[PDB]
Amino acid sequence: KVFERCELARTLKRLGMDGYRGISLANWMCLAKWESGYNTRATNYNAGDRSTDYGIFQINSRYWCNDGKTPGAVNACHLSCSALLQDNIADAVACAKRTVRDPQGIRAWVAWRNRCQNRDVRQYVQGCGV
């Protein structure tokens, strides 16, 4: 599924993402936008370390989900990476929350640092009623 902006903003808000561990909804919106264009079936294989990024937040298989084909990988979210390719984003959100419970917080994703950090992200939630 490819979410429309405000549709996603409300979906994330209902899933308890607004202000989760101090992270605003606008920040999560900026993350999803740059990671996958709000596409839940987006995938990216990394030939360098043989890991794959899955879903709307492009969560990596080396540490967060199990895909059975990533060398010496772990599954901190305790989910099949397939769970991160569903139209329903509840599991991806649980995993995104798991990721930010760690020391880096939202900084876990380099794309967030690249195009969200110290940026004006108000634009992502304006007019969505959140």
Curated annotation (Swiss-Prot):
GO annotation (BP), single: defense response to Gram-negative bacterium
InterPro entries on file: Glyco_hydro_22, Glyco_hydro_22_CS, Glyco_hydro_22_lys, Lysozyme-like_dom_sf
Entry keywords, A to Z: Amyloid, Amyloidosis, Antimicrobial, Bacteriolytic enzyme, Disease variant, Disulfide bond, Glycosidase, Hydrolase, Secreted, Signal
Entry annotated with the keyword Heme: no
Catalyzed reaction equations: Hydrolysis of (1->4)-beta-linkages between N-acetylmuramic acid and N-acetyl-D-glucosamine residues in a peptidoglycan and between N-acetyl-D-glucosamine residues in chitodextrins
Main location: secreted
CDD domains, alphabetized: LYZ_C
Disulfide pairings: 6-128, 30-116, 65-81, 77-95
EC identifiers of the protein: 3.2.1.17
Record GO terms (molecular function): identical protein binding; lysozyme activity
Residue ranges constituting the C-type lysozyme domain according to the UniProt record: 1-130
Record localization: Secreted
One GO CC term on file: specific granule lumen
Active site, UniProt feature: 35, 53
Disease as annotated in the protein's UniProt record: Amyloidosis, hereditary systemic 5: A form of hereditary systemic amyloidosis, a disorder characterized by amyloid deposition in multiple tissues resulting in a wide clinical spectrum. AMYLD5 primarily affects the viscera, and the predominant clinical features are renal dysfunction of varying severity, and intra-abdominal bleeding. Inheritance is autosomal dominant.
Record note on quaternary structure: Monomer.
Family: Belongs to the glycosyl hydrolase 22 family.
Cited function: Lysozymes have primarily a bacteriolytic function; those in tissues and body fluids are associated with the monocyte-macrophage system and enhance the activity of immunoagents.
Other observations noted: Lysozyme C is capable of both hydrolysis and transglycosylation; it also shows a slight esterase activity. It acts rapidly on both peptide-substituted and unsubstituted peptidoglycan, and slowly on chitin oligosaccharides.
UniProt-recorded name of the protein: Lysozyme C
Source organism of the structure: Homo sapiens (Human)
Lineage: Eukaryota, Metazoa, Chordata, Craniata, Vertebrata
Gene assigned in the entry: LYZ
